[PDB]
Enzyme design. Sequence first.
Site, mmCIF file in Angstrom:
data_model
loop_
_atom_site.group_PDB
_atom_site.id
_atom_site.type_symbol
_atom_site.label_atom_id
_atom_site.label_comp_id
_atom_site.label_asym_id
_atom_site.label_seq_id
_atom_site.Cartn_x
_atom_site.Cartn_y
_atom_site.Cartn_z
ATOM 1 N N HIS A 32 -28.224 78.753 -24.612
ATOM 2 C CA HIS A 32 -28.133 78.405 -26.020
ATOM 3 C C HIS A 32 -28.958 79.247 -26.967
ATOM 4 O O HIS A 32 -29.120 78.884 -28.135
ATOM 5 C CB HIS A 32 -28.493 76.939 -26.219
ATOM 6 C CG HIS A 32 -27.466 75.989 -25.686
ATOM 7 N ND1 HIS A 32 -26.188 75.910 -26.197
ATOM 8 C CD2 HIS A 32 -27.539 75.055 -24.709
ATOM 9 C CE1 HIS A 32 -25.523 74.962 -25.559
ATOM 10 N NE2 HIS A 32 -26.319 74.428 -24.652
ATOM 11 N N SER A 69 -22.692 74.965 -20.708
ATOM 12 C CA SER A 69 -23.140 73.966 -21.659
ATOM 13 C C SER A 69 -22.561 74.182 -23.031
ATOM 14 O O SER A 69 -22.942 75.113 -23.738
ATOM 15 C CB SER A 69 -24.656 73.976 -21.747
ATOM 16 O OG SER A 69 -25.104 73.068 -22.738
ATOM 17 N N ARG A 75 -26.220 69.279 -19.046
ATOM 18 C CA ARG A 75 -26.561 67.866 -19.135
ATOM 19 C C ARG A 75 -25.296 67.050 -18.895
ATOM 20 O O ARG A 75 -25.352 65.871 -18.531
ATOM 21 C CB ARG A 75 -27.177 67.545 -20.502
ATOM 22 C CG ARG A 75 -28.483 68.288 -20.729
ATOM 23 C CD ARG A 75 -29.381 67.646 -21.764
ATOM 24 N NE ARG A 75 -28.703 67.361 -23.022
ATOM 25 C CZ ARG A 75 -28.340 66.142 -23.408
ATOM 26 N NH1 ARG A 75 -28.590 65.098 -22.627
ATOM 27 N NH2 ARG A 75 -27.753 65.961 -24.586
ATOM 28 N N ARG A 76 -24.151 67.691 -19.096
ATOM 29 C CA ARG A 76 -22.872 67.047 -18.872
ATOM 30 C C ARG A 76 -22.575 67.338 -17.393
ATOM 31 O O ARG A 76 -22.786 68.464 -16.927
ATOM 32 C CB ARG A 76 -21.821 67.668 -19.791
ATOM 33 C CG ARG A 76 -20.859 66.664 -20.411
ATOM 34 C CD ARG A 76 -21.091 66.460 -21.913
ATOM 35 N NE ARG A 76 -20.942 67.687 -22.706
ATOM 36 C CZ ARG A 76 -21.070 67.743 -24.031
ATOM 37 N NH1 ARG A 76 -21.349 66.646 -24.719
ATOM 38 N NH2 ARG A 76 -20.932 68.896 -24.670
ATOM 39 N N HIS A 117 -20.318 77.090 -29.582
ATOM 40 C CA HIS A 117 -20.452 78.120 -28.564
ATOM 41 C C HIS A 117 -20.661 77.527 -27.178
ATOM 42 O O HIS A 117 -21.147 76.408 -27.028
ATOM 43 C CB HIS A 117 -21.644 79.031 -28.894
ATOM 44 C CG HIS A 117 -22.976 78.349 -28.794
ATOM 45 N ND1 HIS A 117 -23.787 78.133 -29.888
ATOM 46 C CD2 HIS A 117 -23.630 77.818 -27.733
ATOM 47 C CE1 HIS A 117 -24.880 77.496 -29.505
ATOM 48 N NE2 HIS A 117 -24.810 77.292 -28.202
ATOM 49 N N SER A 147 -21.680 73.600 -26.972
ATOM 50 C CA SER A 147 -22.421 73.287 -28.180
ATOM 51 C C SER A 147 -21.365 72.921 -29.222
ATOM 52 O O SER A 147 -20.512 73.744 -29.563
ATOM 53 C CB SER A 147 -23.215 74.499 -28.658
ATOM 54 O OG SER A 147 -23.895 74.209 -29.867
#
Lengths: 4, 4, 226, 222
Positions: free
Chosen positions: D52, D121, D140-141, D132, D123
């Site tokens: 990120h 991940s 986390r998913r 993105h 966003s």
Amino acid sequence: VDNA
Amino acid sequence: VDNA
Amino acid sequence: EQQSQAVAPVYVGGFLARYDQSPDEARLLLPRDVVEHWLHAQVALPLNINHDDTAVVGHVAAMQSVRDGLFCLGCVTSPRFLEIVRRASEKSELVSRGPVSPLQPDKVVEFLSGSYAGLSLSSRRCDETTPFKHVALCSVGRRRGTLAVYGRDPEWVTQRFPDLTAADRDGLRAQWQRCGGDPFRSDSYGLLGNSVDALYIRERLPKLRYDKQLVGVTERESYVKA
Amino acid sequence: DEQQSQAVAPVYVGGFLARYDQSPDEARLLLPRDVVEHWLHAQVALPLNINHDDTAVVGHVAAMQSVRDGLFCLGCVTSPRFLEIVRRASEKSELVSRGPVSPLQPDKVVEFLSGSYAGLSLSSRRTTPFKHVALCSVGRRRGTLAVYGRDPEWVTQRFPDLTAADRDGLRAQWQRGDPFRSDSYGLLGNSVDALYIRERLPKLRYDKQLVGVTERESYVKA
């Protein structure tokens, strides 16, 4: 030799 | 916004 | 400026082995009898990253067999390695969260803490008189109780372990004081590559929480991130 | 040195950004197919970054497709600078040296990415709903395993859940300098962070199986  |  | 003091020498201490702990492999056996004979047998031991002969970042300043195990005092001196660490520490959200209670932030000491949370000795296989070869900073040593405490000062470091008796600190101090270019032959790519290797060591955090509780560094305050 | 020109060639990455059949242990992570399909309908190519970090952009999201079990995306790592860093660092990874499995051929760069960033991940907002996709050590998913490979087609076929229809949608999309303003140091620092993610391996295994990648041959080191 032993490496820890 | 939420980031995973 | 603040960088000048950031890349200053960094001391590291901890047990290379714990007599009360029985290893998981007979080749990790190292009782007080052997250690003390070897010590009396044996130029300072180099200090490298994960036993990498090209990643030597300093030297071991003091070695001492104490009640609970073999304790060693070391010092990271390599300007090249320290600089690499300094650069990365600015990019670690872990390092950005800062240290505990009243300790002052030390991005670098904190980074080494988090990446090389362990110590790993390199001695002759028990089964001419230079038994010990070197000590290695690593994500987790194979011998338990080997937590690594980094610090800017030797006293402060040895003072992190409750086991150590004032008398032990004297043996060490006698050593590291009398002890007093850049041996590093690696770079950031190496460390990075070496870092992925650590992401796949099974139970890294559990072994470290265990090592922290066993050696009493759980009790005091430090830059240990485990 | 010709062995490096192909080593630093584009690398594809695929995986689910979300699984509809997985209940998020946090409401902010909820993201049902309904929202996804409207969003996918509502809205160039989304950037691909490292953990990120908006300065660690390495490529772009080539395709997004809502499918039976979730939102699956396919990306492409194209940063020469980045691919180069990964090359240099792979030569120094024991894990990479252990090589791949069954009859796969060693692909240091790919194997290296596979190991460092086994997770994807997304966003997005709690127009452009999707901001993105990020490469990471774990999402986390749940079920967000990242499968890397030199070929889009090959990569997509590592996922048992996908059907020929699915692959058509994705294929159609993916078929239609240097944004990496970070360095090795930034990567090094970010990895130390990953060593402290609680239950990194456990979730990564859970993900590998759930997504059925366990059942195939791939460079997943997880």
